[PDB]
Scaffold this active site. Structure first.
Site, PDB file in Angstrom:
ATOM      1  N   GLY A  15       0.788  -1.222   0.000  1.00 43.69           N
ATOM      2  CA  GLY A  15       0.000   0.000   0.000  1.00 43.69           C
ATOM      3  C   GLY A  15       0.827   1.282   0.000  1.00 43.69           C
ATOM      4  O   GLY A  15       0.329   2.343   0.411  1.00 43.69           O
ATOM      5  N   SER A  17       2.011   3.005  -2.630  1.00 40.37           N
ATOM      6  CA  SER A  17       1.465   3.982  -3.549  1.00 40.37           C
ATOM      7  C   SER A  17       0.196   4.631  -3.013  1.00 40.37           C
ATOM      8  O   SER A  17       0.043   5.843  -3.126  1.00 40.37           O
ATOM      9  CB  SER A  17       1.168   3.369  -4.920  1.00 40.37           C
ATOM     10  OG  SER A  17       1.019   4.419  -5.840  1.00 40.37           O
ATOM     11  N   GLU A  35       7.626   6.037  -7.375  1.00 38.32           N
ATOM     12  CA  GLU A  35       8.690   5.137  -7.826  1.00 38.32           C
ATOM     13  C   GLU A  35       8.499   4.945  -9.326  1.00 38.32           C
ATOM     14  O   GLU A  35       7.383   5.167  -9.831  1.00 38.32           O
ATOM     15  CB  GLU A  35       8.653   3.804  -7.068  1.00 38.32           C
ATOM     16  CG  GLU A  35      10.056   3.239  -6.714  1.00 38.32           C
ATOM     17  CD  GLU A  35      10.348   1.847  -7.258  1.00 38.32           C
ATOM     18  OE1 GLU A  35      10.992   1.025  -6.550  1.00 38.32           O
ATOM     19  OE2 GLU A  35       9.929   1.577  -8.402  1.00 38.32           O
ATOM     20  N   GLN A  71      17.554  -3.142 -13.157  1.00 36.25           N
ATOM     21  CA  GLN A  71      17.813  -2.529 -11.874  1.00 36.25           C
ATOM     22  C   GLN A  71      18.583  -1.243 -12.074  1.00 36.25           C
ATOM     23  O   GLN A  71      18.305  -0.241 -11.377  1.00 36.25           O
ATOM     24  CB  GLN A  71      18.624  -3.470 -10.982  1.00 36.25           C
ATOM     25  CG  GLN A  71      18.391  -3.270  -9.500  1.00 36.25           C
ATOM     26  CD  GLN A  71      16.913  -3.233  -9.129  1.00 36.25           C
ATOM     27  OE1 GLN A  71      16.135  -4.136  -9.459  1.00 36.25           O
ATOM     28  NE2 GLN A  71      16.518  -2.159  -8.478  1.00 36.25           N
ATOM     29  N   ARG A 102       9.595   4.296  -2.012  1.00 32.78           N
ATOM     30  CA  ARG A 102      10.893   3.571  -1.910  1.00 32.78           C
ATOM     31  C   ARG A 102      12.141   4.494  -1.917  1.00 32.78           C
ATOM     32  O   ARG A 102      12.042   5.729  -1.655  1.00 32.78           O
ATOM     33  CB  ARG A 102      10.990   2.395  -2.910  1.00 32.78           C
ATOM     34  CG  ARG A 102      10.001   1.255  -2.579  1.00 32.78           C
ATOM     35  CD  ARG A 102      10.181  -0.014  -3.426  1.00 32.78           C
ATOM     36  NE  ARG A 102       9.863  -1.229  -2.646  1.00 32.78           N
ATOM     37  CZ  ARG A 102       8.868  -2.091  -2.898  1.00 32.78           C
ATOM     38  NH1 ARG A 102       8.050  -1.931  -3.934  1.00 32.78           N
ATOM     39  NH2 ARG A 102       8.693  -3.143  -2.107  1.00 32.78           N
ATOM     40  N   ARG A 166      -5.121  -5.400  -6.940  1.00 30.48           N
ATOM     41  CA  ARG A 166      -4.563  -4.500  -7.934  1.00 30.48           C
ATOM     42  C   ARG A 166      -4.732  -5.109  -9.334  1.00 30.48           C
ATOM     43  O   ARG A 166      -4.963  -4.387 -10.317  1.00 30.48           O
ATOM     44  CB  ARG A 166      -3.110  -4.194  -7.627  1.00 30.48           C
ATOM     45  CG  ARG A 166      -2.474  -3.291  -8.637  1.00 30.48           C
ATOM     46  CD  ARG A 166      -1.004  -3.523  -8.641  1.00 30.48           C
ATOM     47  NE  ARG A 166      -0.341  -2.776  -7.588  1.00 30.48           N
ATOM     48  CZ  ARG A 166       0.629  -3.259  -6.814  1.00 30.48           C
ATOM     49  NH1 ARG A 166       1.039  -4.516  -6.936  1.00 30.48           N
ATOM     50  NH2 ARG A 166       1.186  -2.478  -5.910  1.00 30.48           N
ATOM     51  N   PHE A 216      -6.721   0.810   5.002  1.00 25.76           N
ATOM     52  CA  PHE A 216      -6.629   2.157   5.582  1.00 25.76           C
ATOM     53  C   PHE A 216      -7.173   3.213   4.631  1.00 25.76           C
ATOM     54  O   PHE A 216      -7.037   4.432   4.862  1.00 25.76           O
ATOM     55  CB  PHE A 216      -5.188   2.500   5.994  1.00 25.76           C
ATOM     56  CG  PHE A 216      -4.181   2.407   4.874  1.00 25.76           C
ATOM     57  CD1 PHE A 216      -4.065   3.430   3.920  1.00 25.76           C
ATOM     58  CD2 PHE A 216      -3.318   1.317   4.789  1.00 25.76           C
ATOM     59  CE1 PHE A 216      -3.114   3.364   2.882  1.00 25.76           C
ATOM     60  CE2 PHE A 216      -2.363   1.230   3.767  1.00 25.76           C
ATOM     61  CZ  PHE A 216      -2.261   2.262   2.801  1.00 25.76           C
TER      62      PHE A 216
HETATM   63  O1  LIG Z   1      -5.268  -0.278   2.794  1.00 26.89           O
HETATM   64  C1  LIG Z   1      -5.205  -0.641   1.613  1.00 26.89           C
HETATM   65  C2  LIG Z   1      -3.990  -0.583   0.919  1.00 26.89           C
HETATM   66  C3  LIG Z   1      -4.000  -0.831  -0.458  1.00 26.89           C
HETATM   67  N1  LIG Z   1      -5.085  -1.488  -1.011  1.00 26.89           N
HETATM   68  C4  LIG Z   1      -5.067  -1.947  -2.402  1.00 26.89           C
HETATM   69  O2  LIG Z   1      -3.978  -2.826  -2.599  1.00 26.89           O
HETATM   70  C5  LIG Z   1      -3.527  -2.683  -3.946  1.00 26.89           C
HETATM   71  C6  LIG Z   1      -2.012  -2.493  -4.022  1.00 26.89           C
HETATM   72  O3  LIG Z   1      -1.594  -1.388  -3.234  1.00 26.89           O
HETATM   73  P1  LIG Z   1      -0.444  -0.365  -3.720  1.00 26.89           P
HETATM   74  O4  LIG Z   1      -0.517  -0.101  -5.173  1.00 26.89           O
HETATM   75  O5  LIG Z   1      -0.504   0.893  -2.923  1.00 26.89           O
HETATM   76  O6  LIG Z   1       0.848  -1.165  -3.213  1.00 26.89           O
HETATM   77  P2  LIG Z   1       2.379  -0.725  -3.380  1.00 26.89           P
HETATM   78  O7  LIG Z   1       2.866  -1.682  -4.445  1.00 26.89           O
HETATM   79  O8  LIG Z   1       2.570   0.665  -3.890  1.00 26.89           O
HETATM   80  O9  LIG Z   1       3.085  -1.032  -2.132  1.00 26.89           O
HETATM   81  C7  LIG Z   1      -4.253  -1.496  -4.574  1.00 26.89           C
HETATM   82  O10 LIG Z   1      -5.239  -1.951  -5.491  1.00 26.89           O
HETATM   83  C8  LIG Z   1      -4.872  -0.795  -3.379  1.00 26.89           C
HETATM   84  O11 LIG Z   1      -6.063  -0.108  -3.705  1.00 26.89           O
HETATM   85  C9  LIG Z   1      -6.286  -1.564  -0.325  1.00 26.89           C
HETATM   86  O12 LIG Z   1      -7.299  -1.989  -0.889  1.00 26.89           O
HETATM   87  N2  LIG Z   1      -6.341  -1.132   0.989  1.00 26.89           N
HETATM   88  C1  LIG Z   2      11.063  -1.622  -7.604  1.00 27.69           C
HETATM   89  C2  LIG Z   2      11.811  -2.853  -8.016  1.00 27.69           C
HETATM   90  C3  LIG Z   2      11.083  -3.991  -8.300  1.00 27.69           C
HETATM   91  N1  LIG Z   2      11.682  -5.136  -8.670  1.00 27.69           N
HETATM   92  C4  LIG Z   2      10.851  -6.318  -8.974  1.00 27.69           C
HETATM   93  C5  LIG Z   2      10.448  -6.236 -10.442  1.00 27.69           C
HETATM   94  C6  LIG Z   2       9.078  -5.586 -10.382  1.00 27.69           C
HETATM   95  O1  LIG Z   2       8.268  -5.989 -11.484  1.00 27.69           O
HETATM   96  C7  LIG Z   2       8.496  -6.045  -9.049  1.00 27.69           C
HETATM   97  C8  LIG Z   2       7.572  -5.022  -8.380  1.00 27.69           C
HETATM   98  O2  LIG Z   2       7.234  -3.923  -9.244  1.00 27.69           O
HETATM   99  O3  LIG Z   2       9.631  -6.322  -8.210  1.00 27.69           O
HETATM  100  C9  LIG Z   2      13.032  -5.170  -8.776  1.00 27.69           C
HETATM  101  O4  LIG Z   2      13.678  -6.313  -9.151  1.00 27.69           O
HETATM  102  N2  LIG Z   2      13.769  -4.060  -8.502  1.00 27.69           N
HETATM  103  C10 LIG Z   2      13.192  -2.897  -8.125  1.00 27.69           C
HETATM  104  O5  LIG Z   2      13.969  -1.811  -7.855  1.00 27.69           O
END
Ligand SMILES: O=c1ccn([C@@H]2O[C@H](COP(=O)(O)OP(=O)(O)O)[C@@H](O)[C@H]2O)c(=O)[nH]1
Ligand SMILES: Cc1cn([C@@H]2C[C@@H](O)[C@H](CO)O2)c(=O)[nH]c1=O
Ligand SMILES: O=c1ccn([C@@H]2O[C@H](COP(=O)(O)OP(=O)(O)O)[C@@H](O)[C@H]2O)c(=O)[nH]1
Ligand SMILES: Cc1cn([C@@H]2C[C@@H](O)[C@H](CO)O2)c(=O)[nH]c1=O
Lengths: 234, 234
Positions: A15, A17, A35, A71, A102, A166, A216
């Site tokens: 969560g 993002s 990110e 990377q 991040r 997601r 949340f």
């Molecule tokens: O409290 C929360 C946190 C996130 N999500 C859902 O979980 C999915 C992934 O979250 P996010 O993209 O923020 O994860 P990140 O990869 O950025 O950590 C999304 O569809 C959000 O809407 C949710 O339903 N409730």
């Molecule tokens: C953000 C990130 C993601 N990953 C892997 C590759 C992505 O597709 C997935 C989440 O986006 O995790 C990496 O190997 N390095 C990275 O720096």
């Protein structure tokens, strides 16, 4: 620097993002840097976006071939985007805060590391990558240096369900076991602090940990109260 | 910076290493930055020599796997060596000149571009490299802009003979046609100046062309004389 840099860390789909986008609207003094890779996934043609989509797809498809290129390019894009905000936005705020989605540290110690451990990078690639990371942040990671980290802690199960919600197509195959590994590294770095990095200041850097296992989305006030608390102590 | 910056450019085995080492000795006011990649070939420690030595050898067996990685590290190696020399010396010099063996420009617009054109990097590797190259240089390489260039111009056939003189194992299979491509590349950039770059100032940088077909190792005085005159204009 008067701009406080705060990174938001945590596993895939925790969560980060969702949490960053929440924060951004709460304060004229608050700005965020998302990110890079998240933008690479969607469609609906900027150069980073074309490169980014392509290399994302090649990574998924052949990891032992593309990890290094991926990377390296993710870090460049993240650094360039962080440096750009740090130099462009927030200029007349009295308590400005830049939240990074991040960081360069997590990029190397969570993601790049698991790749070396997965055999997706060979020894030479790993060590080329660390050397590049080293030199380039000891020029730039300085104006990039963090005043604190915020750790968004969700369990792998939570995280797996959220990959599902997601519903990003290419992610639906990521297995629990993979998130348990990334989980363990985050805890190693941000909780137990047993993780060693090159960047010596990071050992004393304040950390706020927020358990985000419960949705949340419309109940996040208590988290934010915690962040504002954390910010007034740096 | 108070220090004048002059690149030595030329096809493979044109004699750049040789000349650089002559120039070194001529003045206390003249310092040189060696090109990272020869030290990578020869056979004691250094993590960059270890990495570069592996990456070069891997380059030789499968350039379409390793070109992008090789070029990245070669270019990183270059900036860091040219920045280190820029910082660490000619502080007490009255007329300081730093000679760069090759440049980030030849590395990209001659050599990398050749790798792409030979299908050893695809479009994304090449587009990523170019993006990376611009940024690595814009953000880090601003103090490395050239005041001048010295072009050691020799025929593809001089260089083939000189490669045979030098007797590096890997290099003996190099064909004349490869050298001709690289030579025409050099000719377009530095004589005609038809080669357009992403670096605005370069189109304006003074270029001294030196004929180095005739052996100059024991007989370099007229060549140094032209260097001394050239420098005087700048
Ligand atoms: O409290 C929360 C946190 C996130 N999500 C859902 O979980 C999915 C992934 O979250 P996010 O993209 O923020 O994860 P990140 O990869 O950025 O950590 C999304 O569809 C959000 O809407 C949710 O339903 N409730
Ligand atoms: C953000 C990130 C993601 N990953 C892997 C590759 C992505 O597709 C997935 C989440 O986006 O995790 C990496 O190997 N390095 C990275 O720096
Ligand atoms: O005027 C010259 C220039 C050099 N060489 C030899 O030719 C080869 C190519 O020289 P160099 O290593 O300087 O070339 P570069 O660094 O341009 O590839 C080396 O074996 C040199 O010792 C030579 O015999 N006479
Ligand atoms: C110095 C250099 C060399 N090369 C290649 C790499 C080697 O195969 C050969 C040197 O003998 O030239 C590059 O592709 N880029 C370079 O920047």
């Amino acid at each position: 620097t008067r701009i406080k840099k705060i990174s938001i860390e945590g596993n895939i789909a925790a969560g980060k993002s969702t949490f960053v986008n929440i924060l951004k609207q709460l304060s004229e003094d608050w700005e965020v840097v998302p990110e890079p890779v998240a933008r690479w996934s969607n469609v609906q043609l900027t150069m980073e976006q074309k490169n980014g989509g392509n290399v994302l797809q090649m990574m998924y498809e052949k990891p032992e071939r593309w990890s290094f290129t991926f990377q390296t390019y993710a870090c460049l894009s993240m650094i360039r985007a962080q440096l750009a905000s740090l130099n462009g936005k927030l200029k007349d705020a009295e308590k400005p805060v830049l939240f990074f989605e991040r960081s360069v540290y997590s990029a190397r110690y969570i993601f790049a590391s698991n790749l070396y451990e997965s055999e997706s990078m060979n020894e030479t690639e790993w060590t080329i990558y660390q050397d590049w990371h080293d030199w380039m942040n000891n020029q730039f990671g300085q104006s990039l240096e963090l005043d604190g980290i915020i750790y968004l802690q969700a369990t792998p199960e939570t995280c797996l369900h959220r990959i599902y919600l997601r519903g990003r197509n290419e992610e639906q195959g990521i297995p629990l076991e993979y998130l348990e590994k990334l989980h363990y590294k985050h805890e190693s770095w941000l909780l137990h602090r047993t993780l060693k990095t090159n960047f010596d200041y990071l050992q004393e850097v304040p950390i706020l940990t927020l358990d985000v296992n419960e949705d949340f989305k419309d109940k996040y006030e208590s988290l934010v109260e915690k962040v504002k608390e954390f910010l007034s102590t740096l």
